[PDB]
Amino acid sequence: ADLAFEAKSARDYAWYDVSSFLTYRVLRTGELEVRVRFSGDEWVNVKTSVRERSIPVEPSECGRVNVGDLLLCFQEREQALYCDGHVLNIKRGIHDHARCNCVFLVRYELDNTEESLGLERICRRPE
Ligand SMILES: [Zn+2]
Secondary structure (H helix, E strand, O other): OOOOEEEEOOOOOOEEEEEEEEEEEEOOOOOEEEEEEEOOOEEEEHHHHEEEOOEEOOHHHHHHOOOOOEEEEEEEOOOEEEEEEEEEEEEOOOOOOOOOOOEEEEEEOOOOOEEEEEHHHEEEOOO
């Protein structure tokens, strides 16, 4: 499978699946930027704001997610964004391969807010 990407937006600081890359530019400051077309157009800093897409986690492999890990989290508010957070604590549940009822306490990177998310609402970083 070919590499797929997601890009951070400067408007809300959430991440979005990148459909394609159009062009690029260099700031007199030195930074390299790409113009990305999203799925479903921005200039994003390549170094910080573009990265290989996050991956969904299956119930039978929920054990690979540990305290301290970085995760793309579905943050649903009053507004539903996919943004970065770190696992602070994990409550392991009793379940099979069909569904994961573990609870993941996440601290969002932007504002250090905390939320209890289920596996269905998180994606891990590759590797
Ligand atoms: Zn689980």
